[PDB]
Amino acid sequence: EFLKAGKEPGLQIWRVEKFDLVPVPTNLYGDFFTGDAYVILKTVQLRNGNLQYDLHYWLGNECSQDESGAAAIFTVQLDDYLNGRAVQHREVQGFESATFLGYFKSGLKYKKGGVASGFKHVVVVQRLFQVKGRRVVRATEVPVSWESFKNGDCFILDLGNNIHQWCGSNSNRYERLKATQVSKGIRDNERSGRARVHVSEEGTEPEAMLQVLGPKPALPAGTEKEDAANRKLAKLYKVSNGTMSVSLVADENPFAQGALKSEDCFILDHGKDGKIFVWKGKQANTEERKAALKTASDFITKMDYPKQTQVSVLPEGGETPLFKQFFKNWRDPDQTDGLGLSYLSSHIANVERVPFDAATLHTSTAMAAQHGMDDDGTGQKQIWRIEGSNKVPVDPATYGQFYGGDSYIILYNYRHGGRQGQIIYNWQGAQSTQDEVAASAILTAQLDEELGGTPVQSRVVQGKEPAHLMSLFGGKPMIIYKGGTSREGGQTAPASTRLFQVRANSAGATRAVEVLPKAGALNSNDAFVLKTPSAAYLWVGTGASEAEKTGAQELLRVLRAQPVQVAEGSEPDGFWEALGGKAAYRTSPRLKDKKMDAHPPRLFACSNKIGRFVIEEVPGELMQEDLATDDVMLLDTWDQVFVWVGKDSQEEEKTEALTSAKRYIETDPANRDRRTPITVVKQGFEPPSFVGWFLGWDDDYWSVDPLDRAMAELA
């Protein structure tokens, strides 16, 4: 007794019809009647072959309340049949989650009608659609009238055998490109290829358009997405009797993972940013868990949030990456073993995981993107130290050593594929004086412009160097001193006892970072170097590969001391108090390869609108076509925030590319490291570590205007 569901990886959509799940014809996936409710099941195949489920129910604007209730019931009971491991989403028309919208990049059509009105999914047609949206394109069915028209939008007059695409004079070219997807969708999916699509603009309306609409009058402009200030703060509550009562458990993110308890379920309030999460404990009694959706709705009312607020319901052990990022260092029991983690985001579920191999890196942009390496780091490079307001060439014998009282500029030529490119690294010491740091940024930008405005520009801060920057010095480790200086003047002497953290990247290169000499700075994944007046300790953590201890050894040579190698837990006590005694220090191993699972890359459009900084998430798989030439985009790799600069965006947004990327970082509710590197990228000159993230990158994509292409490519 059932309906054929669960199945294999794919997408299944039902329309809730008189308390019954009714399959939508697959060629109409994306069409929704505003008067009905739907249930949607996305099945994702994990890398280990297992199946992971996302259950969404979708409420139309004019949808019922009992019908909405049925959709809520079916979402709950389908999850019951899937043994409670799906994550549930309540999606309202016009404010659906990014995860939901990624299932349809032909757009969404919102149809007039519903079950009660007596309408089905199944030609004699006469509809009109208003198409709004850049990243998330939505086609709202509107009254067939000239009064529905706005000159800032594009409209689709559907006449069955003929489809008329009408684009207002005040509509930007990118919006017209997204509107062609809807017109093609109606042609290829509703009429299955047999329909003409006719494109036109203001003043070139065909006789058919004017025969149903009448003569065209003057038309008004259009009136109808994440302010950055609302992203940051969130709170965590514990529910009781979902007589619904909640108690504040944490008032400021990041939250302690220990705050979550298995016997209860919690609400993570992010409502000022438009979403709340319901985290179900695995030992919460089933009355509470089956009533999670009502508990979330009651919370929306109790806090006067908009009823369109996105609601997510997560089972314990299956929390999404966006949920876990609200927590200080979320660590699973499953973490270091296995193939993935609790969740695998739909938009990367089909990304082949390429291990690093320097010999073949020049042939795989995928490897470049996934490891943050544009090449093996063996090309021509000039290094400058900023003294006053000028670039001063650094002694080549000292290449790889960097002093915290300086800021440097690295010009590097990278080769990947059969193409050469340049990267300008702007390293800023944590103790470099503000004027020279600010001078290094200006001279960096100046160096870019004199080199054609084409080189990659990557702002780096001491202690958080990108993986590619470490690998620039042969087999020698990048050595990073705490607040010295290497200029001709004050060649000042070192401290008595120094400490050095020696970390390696996936390419084998290392960096030796001087840190405060205490036990709390130690780390079991890395080798360490402790130099005292007396001797020299070479400490090796239990997770330290041989590639780290070799790099730590070449550092003990430039320090001119012979080591005494000391394994973690096998420490002589002269070592133990040279730090001031023993204390706790980080031992949980790093994500290494699961970073992409725990922090998948995300694409955003940003904008410095008059007064407020706004970011819009780009849902679905990352596509080159999503990069509008008149936009400044952000590709949030975890270790590094790319900022792609469209060639046709305003000069204001172009020069603000650096700070807009940092306003994005500092407002991130994960409380991202403020030292996180930023990497400005120019349109048409993107590095492999950027393009390798994209399905189908065309090296000649922008040679022809994408809109001129689209009207040609069948329209």
Ligand SMILES: [Cl-]
């Ligand atoms: Cl059954």
Ligand SMILES: [Cl-]
């Ligand atoms: Cl069923």
Ligand SMILES: [Cl-]
């Ligand atoms: Cl949205």
Ligand SMILES: [Cl-]
């Ligand atoms: Cl990888």
Ligand SMILES: [Cl-]
């Ligand atoms: Cl290139």
Ligand SMILES: [Cl-]
């Ligand atoms: Cl990093």
